[PDB]
Design a binder for this molecule. Structure first.
Ligand SMILES: C=C1/C(=C\C=C2/CCC[C@]3(C)[C@@H]([C@H](C)CCCC(C)(C)O)CC[C@@H]23)C[C@@H](O)[C@H](CCn2cnnn2)[C@@H]1O
Length: 253
């Protein structure tokens, strides 16, 4: 009855490994940003103008690209991940990249003004800047909802990295070969999450936290399909590919 098994020595190594992977792949100081193509914020309080200028696209496109590289880094240090055929590594990455980016961006997302703040001012990102990169409310509003949703779970960083690992190693992705193997890696990770929550999370009356976390992985598949729907529509804008990166192109095209 409400059993609380102690963390195995393997389960601990996994956390340590993931905690460390994240420290090595996420820069909380945002010092690489001046390297990205500069943010341009034109005036408007218009889908037409947005698509005409695409003023924020090269900055955000660089930002996402940069992050994909970071996520790729992250995945490589996931225990199990290198044991997969590099083909199941590509598939799992490409189909989760946008989700892990939405997951990881929560570190910069603040409930003070409902923005991602990586700054200073210049690297603050709100609904409007994302519109300025050619996306519509149908993605941007629900993404903000999900951000708040996630902030309120109040995840320990341990839960944050596991959640991201779990998301990457999902056996039910279009095109995976060895779902059996991938499902084994995931189970190992969820068992670590489920157990970690039970030992180390206050109160807890609410270990309900695990169900809520799995629910976030569902919300993510939605935003993923929506993002991909909208990405398609940007691709139709002429001269757009030059505003992107070779990496953003392959991952989403
Ligand atoms: C990507 C990240 C950040 C924010 C994420 C945002 C804010 C702007 C808007 C973003 C990029 C959404 C867009 C709707 C995605 C659009 C991509 C496109 C234009 C290619 O379709 C999805 C996630 C959103 C900021 C920050 O938390 C992180 C920046 C990168 N970083 C820092 N240290 N290590 N990596 C995070 O990965």
């Amino acid at each position: 009855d409400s059993l609380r098994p102690k963390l195995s020595e393997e389960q601990q190594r996994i956390i340590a490994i993931l905690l460390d992977a994240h420290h090595k792949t996420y820069d909380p100081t945002y010092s690489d940003f001046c390297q990205f193509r500069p943010p341009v914020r034109v005036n408007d309080g218009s889908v037409t103008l947005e698509l005409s200028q695409l003023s924020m696209l090269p900055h955000l496109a660089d930002l996402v690209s940069y992050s994909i590289q970071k996520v790729i880094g992250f995945a490589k240090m996931i225990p199990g991940f290198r044991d997969l055929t590099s083909e199941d590594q590509i598939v799992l990455l490409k189909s989760s990249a946008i989700e892990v980016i939405m997951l990881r961006s929560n570190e910069s997302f603040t409930m003070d003004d409902m923005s991602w703040t990586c700054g200073n001012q210049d690297y603050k990102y709100r609904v409007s800047d994302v519109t300025k990169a050619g996306h519509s409310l149908e993605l941007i509003e629900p993404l903000i909802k999900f951000q708040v949703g996630l902030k309120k779970l109040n995840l320990h960083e341990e839960e944050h990295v596991l959640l991201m690992a779990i998301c990457i190693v999902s056996p039910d992705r279009p095109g995976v070969q060895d779902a059996a193997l991938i499902e084994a890696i995931q189970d190992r990770l969820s068992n670590t999450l489920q157990t970690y929550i039970r030992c180390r999370h206050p109160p807890p009356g609410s270990h309900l936290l695990y169900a809520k976390m799995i629910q976030k992985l569902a919300d993510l598949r939605s935003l993923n399909e929506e993002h991909s729907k909208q990405y398609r529509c940007l691709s139709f804008q002429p001269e757009c590919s030059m505003k992107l990166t070779p990496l953003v192109l392959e991952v989403f095209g």
